[PDB]
From a paper:
The catalytic lysine pocket (CLP) is separated from the active site and the external milieu by a hydrophobic cap, formed by the side chains of Val120 and Leu158. A sulfate ion is observed in the active site, interacting with the Arg250 side chain. In contrast, apo-OXA-23 and apo-OXA-58 were crystallized at pH 7.5 and 8.5, respectively, where the catalytic Lys73 is carboxylated and the enzymes are active, allowing direct structural comparison of their NA-1-157 complexes.
The major cause of carbapenem resistance in this pathogen is the production of class D carbapenemases, enzymes that inactivate the last resort carbapenem antibiotics, thus significantly diminishing the available therapeutic options. The major difference in the mechanism of β-lactam antibiotic hydrolysis by the active-site serine enzymes is the use of different amino acid residues for deacylation of the acyl-enzyme intermediate (glutamate for class A, tyrosine for class C, and a carboxylated lysine for class D). Of these, the carbapenemase OXA-23 is by far the most common (~70%) in A. baumannii clinical isolates. In this study, we evaluated the interaction of OXA-23, the most widely disseminated class D carbapenemase in A. baumannii clinical isolates, with the atypically modified carbapenem, NA-1-157.
Numbering used by the authors: 27 to 273
Write the structure that this text describes.
């Protein structure tokens, strides 16, 4: 009369984390040049999606490398009603990164210009590397698309200073992405939510630096719905990283 016991590994647990939210998601992990997939929708890992605000990482790299801006420049709020009151202030590229302040990065994208942007995106080989003709929204409503695996590869290269940009520019953009530090761990990353396409896509791409210096990169990608809190992406990421013993 001994009962059975259900054994939850991290694979089953992370799958069920997405099931509990009634949506499809994948979490891509990269460390030591090895990629592992978790979640309830593993086919998302090799599917192209619009990057949404994850593109701000590459926009910043391009703008700094081509000397269209600098890390101390204060981008002025010129008076239009923005999507959030928190965005209605003068701020640096780094503060706009943390706030995901789209209008600051639209101003930067327009300084870069369509020709230089398209050439730099193709030089990097980011996703499908197609930006179309609208310089101020190509990362929000297409035509630019990238897979979660491509995002984890990109962000791990950034973390290791391996992208084809100067070392100082990569270090500066990394500094804009710090989200949390505690107990010798650092978490860097960038959220994204393409709300104006269907299906909506949500992202959280970044990396953990562990106390011994090891880098564990991640790209979370999930289908969003309007009723979800934005923090759902952070919640799913943090619970999964803990289950994986990354933090």
């Amino acid at each position: 009369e001994t009962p059975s016991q259900i054994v939850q590994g991290h694979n089953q647990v992370i799958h069920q984390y997405f099931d509990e939210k009634n949506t499809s998601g994948v979490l891509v992990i990269q460390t030591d040049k090895k990629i592992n997939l978790y979640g309830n929708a593993l086919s998302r890992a090799n599917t192209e999606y619009v990057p949404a605000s994850t593109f701000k990482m590459l926009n910043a790299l391009i703008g700094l490398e081509n000397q269209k801006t600098d890390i101390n420049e204060i981008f002025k709020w010129k008076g239009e009603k923005r999507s959030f009151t928190a965005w209605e202030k003068d701020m640096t590229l780094g503060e706009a990164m943390k706030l995901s302040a789209v209008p600051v990065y639209q101003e930067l994208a327009r300084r870069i210009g369509l020709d230089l942007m398209q050439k730099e995106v193709k030089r990097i080989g980011f996703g499908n590397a197609e930006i179309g003709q609208q310089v101020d929204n190509f990362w929000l409503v297409g035509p630019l698309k990238v897979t979660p695996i491509q995002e984890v590869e990109f962000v791990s290269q950034l973390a290791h200073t391996q992208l084809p940009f100067s070392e100082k520019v990569q270090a500066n953009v990394k500094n804009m992405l710090l989200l949390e530090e505690s107990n010798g761990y650092k978490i860097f990353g960038k959220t994204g939510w393409a709300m104006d396409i269907k299906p909506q896509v949500g992202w959280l791409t970044g990396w953990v630096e562990q106390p011994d210096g090891k880098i564990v990169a991640f790209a979370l990608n999930m289908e969003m719905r309007s009723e979800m809190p934005a923090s759902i992406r952070n919640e799913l990421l943090m619970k999964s990283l803990k289950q994986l013993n990354i933090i």
